[PDB]
Amino acid sequence: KDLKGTKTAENLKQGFIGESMANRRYLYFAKRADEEGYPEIAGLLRSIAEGETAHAFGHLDFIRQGGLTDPATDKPIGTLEQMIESAIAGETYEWTQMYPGFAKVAREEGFPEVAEWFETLARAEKSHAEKFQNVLKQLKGGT
Amino acid sequence: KDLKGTKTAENLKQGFIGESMANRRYLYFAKRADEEGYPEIAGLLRSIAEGETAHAFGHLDFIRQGGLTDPATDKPIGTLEQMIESAIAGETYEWTQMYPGFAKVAREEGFPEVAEWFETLARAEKSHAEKFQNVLKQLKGGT
Amino acid sequence: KDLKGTKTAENLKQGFIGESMANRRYLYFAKRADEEGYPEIAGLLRSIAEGETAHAFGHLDFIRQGGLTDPATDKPIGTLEQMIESAIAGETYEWTQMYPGFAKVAREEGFPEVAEWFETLARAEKSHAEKFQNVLKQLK
Amino acid sequence: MKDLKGTKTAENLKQGFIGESMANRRYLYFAKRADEEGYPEIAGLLRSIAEGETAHAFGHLDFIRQGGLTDPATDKPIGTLEQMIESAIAGETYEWTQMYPGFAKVAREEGFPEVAEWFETLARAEKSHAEKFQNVLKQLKGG
Amino acid sequence: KDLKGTKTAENLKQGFIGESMANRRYLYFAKRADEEGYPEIAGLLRSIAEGETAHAFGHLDFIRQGGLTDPATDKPIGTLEQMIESAIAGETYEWTQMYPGFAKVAREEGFPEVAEWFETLARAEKSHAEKFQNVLKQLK
Amino acid sequence: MKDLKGTKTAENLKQGFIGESMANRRYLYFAKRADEEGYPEIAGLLRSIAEGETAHAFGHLDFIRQGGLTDPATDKPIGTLEQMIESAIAGETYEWTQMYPGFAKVAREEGFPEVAEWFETLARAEKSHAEKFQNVLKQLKGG
Numbered sequence: 001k002d003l004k005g006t007k008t009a010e011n012l013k014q015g016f017i018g019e020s021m022a023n024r025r026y027l028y029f030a031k032r033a034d035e036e037g038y039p040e041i042a043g044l045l046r047s048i049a050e051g052e053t054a055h056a057f058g059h060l061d062f063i064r065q066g067g068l069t070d071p072a073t074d075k076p077i078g079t080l081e082q083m084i085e086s087a088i089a090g091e092t093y094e095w096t097q098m099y100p101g102f103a104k105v106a107r108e109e110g111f112p113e114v115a116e117w118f119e120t121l122a123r124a125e126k127s128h129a130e131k132f133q134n135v136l137k138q139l140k141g142g143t
Numbered sequence: 144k145d146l147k148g149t150k151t152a153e154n155l156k157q158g159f160i161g162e163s164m165a166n167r168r169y170l171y172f173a174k175r176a177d178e179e180g181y182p183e184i185a186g187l188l189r190s191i192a193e194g195e196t197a198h199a200f201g202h203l204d205f206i207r208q209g210g211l212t213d214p215a216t217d218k219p220i221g222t223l224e225q226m227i228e229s230a231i232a233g234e235t236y237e238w239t240q241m242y243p244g245f246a247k248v249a250r251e252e253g254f255p256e257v258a259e260w261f262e263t264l265a266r267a268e269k270s271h272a273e274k275f276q277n278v279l280k281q282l283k284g285g286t
Numbered sequence: 287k288d289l290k291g292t293k294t295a296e297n298l299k300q301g302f303i304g305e306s307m308a309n310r311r312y313l314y315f316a317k318r319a320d321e322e323g324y325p326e327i328a329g330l331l332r333s334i335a336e337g338e339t340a341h342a343f344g345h346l347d348f349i350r351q352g353g354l355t356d357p358a359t360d361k362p363i364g365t366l367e368q369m370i371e372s373a374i375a376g377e378t379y380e381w382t383q384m385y386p387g388f389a390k391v392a393r394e395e396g397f398p399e400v401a402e403w404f405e406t407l408a409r410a411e412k413s414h415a416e417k418f419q420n421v422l423k424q425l426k
Numbered sequence: 427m428k429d430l431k432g433t434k435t436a437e438n439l440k441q442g443f444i445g446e447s448m449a450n451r452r453y454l455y456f457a458k459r460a461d462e463e464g465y466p467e468i469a470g471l472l473r474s475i476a477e478g479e480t481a482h483a484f485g486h487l488d489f490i491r492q493g494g495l496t497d498p499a500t501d502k503p504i505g506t507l508e509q510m511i512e513s514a515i516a517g518e519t520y521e522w523t524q525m526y527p528g529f530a531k532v533a534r535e536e537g538f539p540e541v542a543e544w545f546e547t548l549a550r551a552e553k554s555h556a557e558k559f560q561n562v563l564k565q566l567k568g569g
Numbered sequence: 570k571d572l573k574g575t576k577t578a579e580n581l582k583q584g585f586i587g588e589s590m591a592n593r594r595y596l597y598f599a600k601r602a603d604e605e606g607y608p609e610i611a612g613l614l615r616s617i618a619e620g621e622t623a624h625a626f627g628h629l630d631f632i633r634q635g636g637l638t639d640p641a642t643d644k645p646i647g648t649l650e651q652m653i654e655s656a657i658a659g660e661t662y663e664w665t666q667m668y669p670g671f672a673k674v675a676r677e678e679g680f681p682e683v684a685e686w687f688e689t690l691a692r693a694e695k696s697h698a699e700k701f702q703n704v705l706k707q708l709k
Numbered sequence: 710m711k712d713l714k715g716t717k718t719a720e721n722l723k724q725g726f727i728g729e730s731m732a733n734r735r736y737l738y739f740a741k742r743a744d745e746e747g748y749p750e751i752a753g754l755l756r757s758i759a760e761g762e763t764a765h766a767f768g769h770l771d772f773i774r775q776g777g778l779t780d781p782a783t784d785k786p787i788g789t790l791e792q793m794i795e796s797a798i799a800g801e802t803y804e805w806t807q808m809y810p811g812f813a814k815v816a817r818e819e820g821f822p823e824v825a826e827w828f829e830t831l832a833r834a835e836k837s838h839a840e841k842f843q844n845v846l847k848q849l850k851g852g
C-alpha cells in the first residue's frame with residue numbers, strides 16, 4: 001500500500017522530529033554531567049543518544065523507501081543529489097525567511113542579545129547554502 | 144524582560160526543532176555519500192552538522208538562562224536533576240502513549256512492518272526510562 | 287630481527303585480519319543494541335572495539351618493524367608516501383578487477399541486488415583512487 | 427532473494443567484508459602518520475575515506491545476515507542481538523584458548539620473544555573480553 | 570639512554586604542556602567557526618588538533634621510555650596500575666588543595682562567579698578521585 | 710565583572726587551563742593501555758572523565774575571554790574568530806622557528822639523537838600548520 005496521505009506518514013514525520021530533539025537534548029545534558037564530575041551519568045546519556053540516532057535514521061529509511069519527503073523541507077531524499085537539494089532548500093528558508101523574521105520579532109519585543117544570535121545564525125545558514133550549491137554543481141558534472 | 148509568553152520564546156523552540164533535524168539529516172545524507180565514494184561531500188556534511196550542533200545548543204542556552212522549559216517535554220532544565228527528570232518524562236510519553244498509538248494506527252492502515260518498528264521503539268524507550276530512573280535515585284542520594 | 291619466511295610473519299597477518307574484522311563486527315552489533323534499548327551492551331561493544339583497534343595497530347607496528355609488507359596489498363608501508371601508494375594499489379585492484387568480477391558472478395548465480403551493490407562499490411573505489419592520486423604531489 | 431548458502435557470491439561477500447575491514451584499519455593507521463608529520467588534509471581524506479569503507483563493510487554484513495549466512499569471523503549466526511553476543515563470545519574464546527597462545531609458542535620457538543609477549547598480552551585481553559560478553563549474555567537471557 | 574637531570578628531560582615536559590594546550594585551544598576555536606558558518610575552517614582546526622594529539626602522545630612515549638615521571642603529578646606511569654595511581658594523585662591534589670585555594674583567592678580579589686566555578690570543579694575532581702579509587706581493585 | 714588583568718585569579722585561570730589540558734591528554738593516553746590489556750570498563754571511565762576535563766578547560770577559556778585576558782599559550786587575544794586564527798599562527802611560528810629547533814640542537818648535544826629527530830619532525834609539522842592557518846586567515850579577511 002502507498003504511505004502517501006496516511007496517518008502513518010505523519011507519524012513517521014513526528015517520530016523523526018522527537019528522535020532528533022532527544023539526541024540533541026541528551027548530548028547537551030551530558031555536558032552538565034561532565035562539568036559537575038558525573039562520568040557514569042554522562043556516559044549513559046551519550047550511549048542512549050546513540051539509540052536515538054538509530055531510531056531517527058530508521059524513521060528516515062521508512063520515509064525514503066516509501067517515497068515520502070524530508071520532514072524538514074517537504075523535498076524528496078531518494079538520491080544523493082536530491083539529499084543535497086533538500087539541504088539547500090532548508091538553508092535557504094532559514095537565512096531568507098526564518099532567522100531574519102525571528103531577529104526582527106526579538107528586537108521588537110526587547111531582546112537584542114537574542115536578535116544578535118538569530119542574525120549570526122542567518123549569516124551562518126547563508127554560508128552553508130553557498131557551500132552546498134558548490135557541491136551540487138560538481139555532482140551535476142561541473143567545476 | 145521576561146521571555147515567558149513571548150513570540151521570541153516560541154521562536155527559540157522552533158529554532159531548536161529545526162537545528163535538531165538538520166544535524167540528523169546531514170549525518171544520514173553523509174552515509175549515502177560514504178557508500179558511493181564521495182569523501183569530500185561526506186566531510187562537508189559532517190562539518191556543517193557540527194555547526195548545527197552549535198546552533199541547537201545555543202538555542203537551549205537562551206531557553207535555560209531565560210527560565211523557559213525544554214522544547215520536547217515542557218519541563219524545566221536548569222539543574223542536572225531537572226535534566227534527568229525531563230529525559231524520564233519524554234521516554235515515558237513515548238512508550239506509554241506515542242509509539243503504541245502509532246503502532247495501532249499503522250496496523251489499522253495496513254503497514255505491519257512499520258507497526259513492528261514502532262513496537263520495537265516503544266520497548267526501547269521503556270528501557271531508557273528505567274535506566275534514567277535508576278540514575279535519578281542515585282542523584283537524590285540512594286542506592 | 288627479520289620476520290621474512292617465518293610462521294610468525296604469517297601469524298601477524300592473520301592476527302591483523304581477525305582484529306580488523308572484530309572491530310567492524312562489534313560496531314555493527316552495537317547498532318542493534320542501540321535500536322533495541324540496550325545502552326550498557328552497546329557501550330561495552332564500543333569500548334571492547336577500541337581494544338581491537340589497539341590490537342590491530344600493534345600487529346601493523348610489528349609487520350612494519352620486521353620489514354614485512356601491507357597485509358592487504360603486499361606493498362611496503364614504511365613512509366607516508368609508501369602508505370598512500372599502498373592505498374592507491376588496493377583501490378585500483380578493487381575498481382579495475384575485484385568488484386566488477388564479484389558483480390559478474392552475482393549476476394551469473396541469480397543475485398541481481400547483490401550484483402548492483404558490487405557495482406556501486408566498484409564505482410566508489412574508483413573515486414577513492416582518484417582522490418588519493420591527487421594528493422601524491424604533496425609527498426613529492 | 428535466492429538462498430546464498432554454498433554459492434561463490436557467499437564467498438565473495440565474506441572476502442569483501444575482510445578487505446573492507448582491513449581498509450578502514452589501514453587508513454586510520456596511515457592517518458596517524460600524516461597527523462605527526464603535518465599533513466592535515468591527507469589525514470582528513472584518509473579518515474573520510476575510512477567512513478566509506480565502514481559503510482561498505484556494514485553493507486556486506488547486511489546481505490550476509492539477510493541471506494541467512496554466518497558471521498565471516500566465527501561461522502556463527504548473527505540474526506538476533508543474543509546471536510551477535512554468542513558470536514563475539516565464540517571469537518574471543520577461539521583467540522585466547524587456541525589462536526594467540528599457539529602464535530606465542532611459535533614466536534618464542536622462532537626467536538621473537540617481544541612478539542611472543544605481545545601475543546600473550548592479547549590472549550589475556552581476549553580472555554577478559556570473553557568473560558565480559560558472557561556476563562552480558564546472562565543479563566540478556568534473564569530479562 | 571637515561572634522561573634524568575638533562576635539559577632534554579625538561580624540554581619533553583614543556584613540549585607535552587604546549588601540545589596539550591594546542592589541542593584544547595584548536596577544538597575551542599573550532600566551535601566559534603561552527604556557529605559562524607565556516608565548516609572548512611572548523612574542519613582544518615579539528616584535523617590539525619589530531620596532529621597535536623600525536624605530538625603529545627609521542628612526548629609521553631619518550632618520557633616513559635627514558636624513566637621520567639608524569640609531567641602533571643611527578644609519579645611514575647610505566648604500568649596501567651601506575652597510570653591509575655597518577656590519575657588519583659592529581660585528582661586528590663586538585664580537590665583537597667588546588668581548586669579550593671583558587672576559589673579562596675577569587676573571593677578575596679572580588680570575582681564571585683569565578684570563585685563558584687572553582688568550587689564546582691573542586692567537587693567534580695573529588696568525584697573523579699572516587700571513581701578511580703573504585704577501579705584499583707581490578708589492577709590487584 | 711571586575712577586570713581580571715594583573716590579578717592572582719588571572720594566573721590561576723591560566724594554570725587551571727594547563728592542568729585541565731594535560732589531564733585530558735593523560736587520560737586518553739592511559740585509556741589506550743587499558744584497551745590493549747583488556748580493561749574496557751577502565752578505558753571507558755578514562756574516556757568519560759576526559760570529557761569532564763574538556764568541559765573544565767573550555768570553562769576556564771570562557772572566563773579568560775570574557776574578562777579580556779589573552780590566550781594562555783601565546784599571550785595573544787582570542788575574542789574573535791580572526792584573533793583565534795592569529796593566535797594559532799603565533800604559536801605554530803614560535804614552535805617551528807624557536808622552540809623545536811632549539812630542543813633538537815640540545816638533544817643532539819646531550820646524546821639523544823632519536824629525540825632530536827622527533828623534535829625535527831615536529832618543527833616541520835608546525836611549519837606546515839602555520840602555512841595552512843595563514844591561508845585560512847587570507848580567506849577570512851578577503852570575505
Ligand SMILES: [Cl-]
Pocket residue numbers: 037038039040041042
Ligand atoms: Cl557518575
Ligand SMILES: [Cl-]
Pocket residue numbers: 180181182183184185
Ligand atoms: Cl567527494
Ligand SMILES: [Cl-]
Pocket residue numbers: 323324325326327328
Ligand atoms: Cl543495557
Ligand SMILES: [Cl-]
Pocket residue numbers: 424464465466467468469
Ligand atoms: Cl596535507
Ligand SMILES: [Cl-]
Pocket residue numbers: 606607608609610611
Ligand atoms: Cl569555511
Ligand SMILES: [Cl-]
Pocket residue numbers: 707747748749750751752
Ligand atoms: Cl575494566
Ligand SMILES: [Fe+3]
Pocket residue numbers: 019022051052055264268
Ligand atoms: Fe528514541
Ligand SMILES: [Fe+3]
Pocket residue numbers: 091124125128165191194195
Ligand atoms: Fe545550516
Ligand SMILES: [Fe+3]
Pocket residue numbers: 121125162165194195198
Ligand atoms: Fe543551523
Ligand SMILES: [Fe+3]
Pocket residue numbers: 022048051052234267268271
Ligand atoms: Fe529513548
Ligand SMILES: [Fe+3]
Pocket residue numbers: 305308337338341548552
Ligand atoms: Fe583483539
Ligand SMILES: [Fe+3]
Pocket residue numbers: 377410411414449475479
Ligand atoms: Fe576504497
Ligand SMILES: [Fe+3]
Pocket residue numbers: 407411446449478479482
Ligand atoms: Fe570499500
Ligand SMILES: [Fe+3]
Pocket residue numbers: 308334337338518551552555
Ligand atoms: Fe577481543
Ligand SMILES: [Fe+3]
Pocket residue numbers: 588591620621624831835
Ligand atoms: Fe604540535
Ligand SMILES: [Fe+3]
Pocket residue numbers: 660693694697732758762
Ligand atoms: Fe578530574
